[PDB]
Amino acid sequence: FVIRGNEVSQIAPGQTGNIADYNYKLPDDFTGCVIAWNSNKLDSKVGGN
Amino acid sequence: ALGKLQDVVNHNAQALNTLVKQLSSKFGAISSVLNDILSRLDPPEAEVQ
């Protein structure tokens, strides 16, 4: 998925947030890795993406 | 005269009182009440408390 720059802390177990609660929820016993990288070059437009 | 028997009674009640008193001990946590810990913290740190 694609999120904001400040919302990368919310992709974690047990977090209270808007995308955490209503978009993507992680379990408390989650195992694995979260990968986040900037996509300004591809997922942004000057007029607004 | 009857110090020994009373002592046994004295020990037993005191032990229960001490055990009950131990419920009011933070034990290095923010609060001694489980409901407050659940109502105030996220599960990653609430689990620790």
Report B:13-42 residues touching A (Cβ under 8 A): 42
Give resolution, Å, one decimal: 2.5
State the Cα angle at A10 between B31 and B42, rounded to 5°.
Answer: 15
State the Cα angle at A7 between A46 and B42, rounded to 5°.
Answer: 170
Alpha helices in chain B (DSSP H): 3-21, 34-40, 43-48
- Cα–Cα dist B26/A10, whole Å: 29
Chain A residues within an 8 Å CB radius of B47:
28
The experimental method, as deposited, was cryo-EM
B38 in Cβ contact with B46 (< 8 Å) = yes
- Number of residues written out for chain A: 49
Question: A16-48: string of b/e by CB count within 10 Å (b at 16+)?
Answer: eeeebeeeeeeeeeeeeeeeeeeeeeeeeeeee
